[PDB]
């Protein structure tokens, strides 16, 4: 409910983000066409999601900063930093969709699949990343936490890219990769590719903005948040195959793309030798009938039911971590995030 | 000669760069495979060039810092910042080669063309970019110019990406784009895509490291350097078609790629209406015989000789700018760069 309360306000501020990021068209008109492109890229790729990561910045800031310190300018900085996290997500998704051969995202054709865009989307993606640091400069440069935020975003990006490296290394095209698909490898991939930027980053950013800079407070927050991120990525992998695409907004490519998904890991742990062979002959290939055979195997092994049980046990574990590590931060900071992600269908 | 003096020392420090960037394999072994990938990406893509941009940092630092202040640790910071510029170049080239459909670079097949790499090179490129900020943290975080360097690299990246946007917008695949190929557009593209990061960045970085942070000194340096960058990109465009590939290390794709090259701009200024039509029917297309026809037109219009004359007049103009704007910096700082770029065959 705390996310829904802030959502309209948050999305309304996108206009101002776009206006501020396109405002150099005024002083350097020679870059006009490029700024028009950047606006198109922002409108297509930074809108249409759920805004969970950016909204988390704003909700956390409200909960962590004394209300007498939530002046107009401070709140605007908070909505701007939330939008920075959304721009990071947009950078990542544009590039990921290329690398994953994806078709749709957030209910529309991926940006790179648009006629006339193609591999120029590489540059578009990187432009989105640059916009983060332009926003941080424009709004936060005189604040004591400016450097902490720059470094947090840079570090989060590095960690995420390292995860993406592990994801791509574990999933080579055209090679049987089943031996590589272990729980230990899975946990390492998702910690780096998803958990740092999707969970630690937004809460950390709010913490820094609230003046909470201590190593121990950041570490304790991290303990909760990285585990939440692991669950989130497990959910994401489950939904890639079993999610309703009218809800998720995107077609799944994990099977065709040979990915170390939580699904294929759980399949491997349960498979008879005959099933192992079915998996080997059908995984990591573009043929629709081979993708169908893998899904049928997962259903044979009751993986949906194993997921539902896992979601229950994971929720309980994260709540136990909140009891242990939330203090001295309000537990509502973590509880509002848990509510948002658990039982998520998108 | 000042570049040759520093070159061996500079390249010898690459081992240490790689060692420092791969040293977290020790403390977080779960990312071992990713760090092994990053090492392969660094070895393939950050070596084999001329190192002009990174060496410029080191030469400038030597010339701008009092010799009694060039202690071991300071010099190491200077070689590290030079390598940061080289890593930026490597990020850019890996991604550019994808976007331009290039075949070779620095004498070998482009990284993305390597079997088993492909569009995973998108992530590789971005990893190179992240390494810049990891190096700046590791070596320069306690220095008074740390924030100035972070912001300079971020800004240079943004400007470069804006230029790349103009480059791609002006060169749409499959569309006749001749009307867009003007001198004014050309000058704007190359200022952003090349001149900021290739000329202003390395000298500015050295300036900041020497404690020269003034807006006016940075502006005057910029006046020289952006014009030098324009010449450099004109040279690059000339060499794309007329350079010896055994020297340049890369096959030209500007004609096939529909680019706003200096060549096609100069062609348009000189072309009869019949020649205009030959250009229209043959430019921006992959057919080798059509590329051949454009080259033959350029030679008919004596464009090599127009380039040689342009190089002479440009050299004189840049030298006049040095006389005007070098002070109070040593003119050798700019003169050593001019010597390196003029009469360049690579
Ligand atoms: C430089 C750029 C390539 O770096 C990144 C780009 C994208 C990502 C990333 C991280 C986490 N999730 C995604 N996307 C998900 P999604 O496609 O949204 O289901 P995944 O492909 O991992 O299943 C992408 C991480 C890094
Ligand atoms: C995000 C990434 C796409 O951003 C960039 C990548 C590359 C470049 C860039 C800038 C200047 N020169 C190059 N390459 C040259 P080159 O291929 O080396 O002849 P150009 O293709 O412009 O003729 C690339 C600029 C931006
Ligand atoms: Mg994906
Ligand atoms: Mg992916
Ligand atoms: Mg997914
Ligand atoms: Mg190129
Ligand atoms: Mg190019
Ligand atoms: Mg070129």
DSSP B241-262: HHS-HHHH-S---TTTTT---H
* Number of structural domains chain A divides into: 1
For ligand 3, the distance from its centroid to the CA atom of residue A101, given in whole angstroms, is 8
Distance CA A226, CA A297 (A): 30
Distance CA A94, CA A153 (A): 18
Catalytic-residue membership of B73: no
- Would strands B108-109 and B104-105 be described as parallel, antiparallel, or unpaired? antiparallel
Q: Which residues make Cβ contacts (< 8 Å) with residue A146, sequence separation at least 6?
A: A136, A140
Token pair of A223 as six digits: 């303990």
Angle between helix axes B146-170 and B121-140 (nearest 10 degrees) is 160
DSSP secondary structure code for residue A192 in this structure: I
Token pair of B71 as six digits: 């202690």
CATH number at residue A80: 1.10.600.10
Helix (H, G, I), strand (E, B) or coil at A242: helix
- From residue A38, alpha-carbon distances to A125, A281, B155, B164, B243 in Å are 10, 44, 16, 12, 34
Q: Which residues make Cβ contacts (< 8 Å) with residue B23, sequence separation at least 6?
A: none
Q: Residues A272, A275, A277, CA angle at the centre, nearest 5°? A: 115
Which chain B residue's Cα is nearest to A184? B30
Resolution reached, in Å? 1.9
Token pair of A125 as six digits: 């993606």
The H-assigned helical ranges of chain B are 2-12, 14-22, 24-27, 32-45, 52-64, 72-99, 121-140, 146-170, 183-190, 201-209, 215-242, 245-248, 262-270, 273-282, 288-300, 303-325, 331-341
Helix (H, G, I), strand (E, B) or coil at A109: strand
* Residue tagged active-site, from B153, B232, B307, B334: B232
B304: domain range?
A: 1-346
Which among B35, B119, B165 is the nearest to A34, CB-wise?
B165
- A121 within 8 A of A141, measured Cβ to Cβ: no
Phi, psi of B109 (to 5 degrees): -60, 135
DSSP secondary structure code for residue A29 in this structure: G
Catalytic-residue membership of B236: yes
Which among B116, B120, B168 is the nearest to A99, CB-wise?
B120
- Whether residue B161 and residue A120 make contact (CB cut-off 8 A), yes or no, is no
Which residue precedes each gap in chain A (C to N above 2.5 Å)?
Answer: none
* Residue B7 annotated as binding site: no
Per-residue H/E/C for B110-142: CHHHCCCCHHHHHHHHHHHHHHHHHHHHHHHCC
Q: Please list the residues that pair with B104 across neighbouring strands.
A: B109
Q: In testing the pocket of ligand 2, which one of B96, B107, B192 has its CB within 8 Å of the most ligand atoms? A: B96
Hey, is the C-beta of A72 within 8 angstroms of any chain B C-beta?
no
Helix (H, G, I), strand (E, B) or coil at A154: helix
Q: Please list the residues that pair with B108 across neighbouring strands.
A: B105
Length of chain A: 346
Helix (H, G, I), strand (E, B) or coil at A212: coil
| Nearest atom within ligand 1 for CA of residue A254 | 23
Hey, is the C-beta of B27 within 8 angstroms of any chain A C-beta?
no
CA B144 to chain centre: 27
Query: B257 CB under 6 A from ligand 2?
Result: no
* Residue tagged active-site, from B14, B92, B100, B307: B100
Query: B191 CB under 6 A from ligand 2?
Result: no
Peptide bond into A328 cis (omega under 30): yes
* Residue B194 annotated as binding site: yes
For ligand 4, the distance from its centroid to the CA atom of residue A260, given in whole angstroms, is 10
Scored b (16 or more CB within 10 A) or e, A293-329 reads bbbebbeebebeebbeebbeebeeebbebbeebbeeb
- From residue B56, alpha-carbon distances to A205, B52, B138, B340 in Å are 36, 6, 21, 10
- B345 within 8 A of B244, measured Cβ to Cβ: yes
| Nearest atom within ligand 2 for CA of residue B259 | 23
State how far residue B31 is from chain A, nearest Cα, in angstroms. 7
Closest C-alpha among B242, B288, B248 to residue B108: B248
- B22 within 8 A of B35, measured Cβ to Cβ: yes
Hey, is the C-beta of B130 within 8 angstroms of any chain A C-beta?
yes
- B213 within 8 A of B148, measured Cβ to Cβ: yes
The residue with tokens 């057919």 is B287
B287 φ/ψ sector (left φ>0, alpha ψ -120 to 50, else beta): beta
**Which DSSP string corresponds to B190-230?**
HIIIIIIIIIIHHHHHHHHHTT---HHHHHHHHHHHHHHHH
For ligand 4, the distance from its centroid to the CA atom of residue A102, given in whole angstroms, is 9
- B322 within 8 A of B335, measured Cβ to Cβ: yes
Distance CA B245, CA B105 (A): 10
Distance CA A150, CA B167 (A): 29
Distance CA A65, CA A176 (A): 51
Distance CA B128, CA B97 (A): 15
């Amino acid at each position: 409910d705390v996310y829904a309360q802030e959502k309209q306000d948050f999305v309304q501020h996108f206009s101002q983000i776009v206006r501020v990021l396109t405002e150099d068209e005024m002083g350097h008109p020679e870059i006009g066409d490029a700024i028009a492109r950047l606006k198109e890229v922002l409108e297509y790729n930074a809108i249409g999601g759920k805004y969970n990561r950016g909204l988390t910045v704003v909700v956390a800031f409200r909960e962590l900063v004394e209300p007498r310190k939530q002046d107009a300018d401070s709140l605007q900085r908070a909505w701007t930093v939330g939008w920075c996290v959304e721009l990071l997500q947009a950078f990542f998704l544009v590039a990921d969709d290329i690398m994953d051969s994806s078709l749709t995202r957030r209910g529309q054709i991926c940006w790179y699949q648009k006629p006339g865009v193609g591999l120029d989307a590489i540059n578009d993606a990187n432009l989105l990343e640059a916009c983060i640091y332009r926003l941080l400069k424009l709004y936060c440069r005189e604040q004591p936490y400016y450097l902490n935020l720059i470094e947090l975003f840079l570090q989060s990006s590095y960690q995420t890219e390292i995860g993406q490296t592990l994801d791509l290394l574990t999933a080579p095209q055209g090679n049987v990769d089943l031996v590589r698909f272990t729980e230990k490898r899975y946990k390492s991939i998702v910690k780096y590719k998803t958990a740092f930027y999707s969970f630690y980053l937004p809460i950390a950013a709010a913490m820094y903005m609230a003046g909470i800079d201590g190593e121990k407070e950041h570490a304790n927050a991290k303990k909760i948040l990285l585990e939440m991120g692991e669950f989130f990525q497990i959910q994401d992998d489950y939904l890639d195959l079993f999610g309703d695409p009218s809800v998720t907004g995107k077609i799944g490519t994990d099977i065709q793309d040979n990915k170390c998904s939580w699904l294929v890991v759980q399949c491997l742990q349960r498979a008879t030798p005959e099933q192992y062979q079915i998996l080997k002959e059908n995984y990591g290939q573009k043929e629709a009938e081979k993708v169908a055979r893998v899904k049928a195997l997962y259903e044979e092994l009751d993986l949906p039911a194993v997921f539902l049980q896992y979601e229950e046990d994971s929720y309980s574990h994260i709540m136990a971590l909140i009891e242990q590590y939330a203090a001295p931060l309000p537990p509502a900071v973590f509880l509002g995030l848990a509510r948002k992600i658990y039982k998520r269908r998108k």
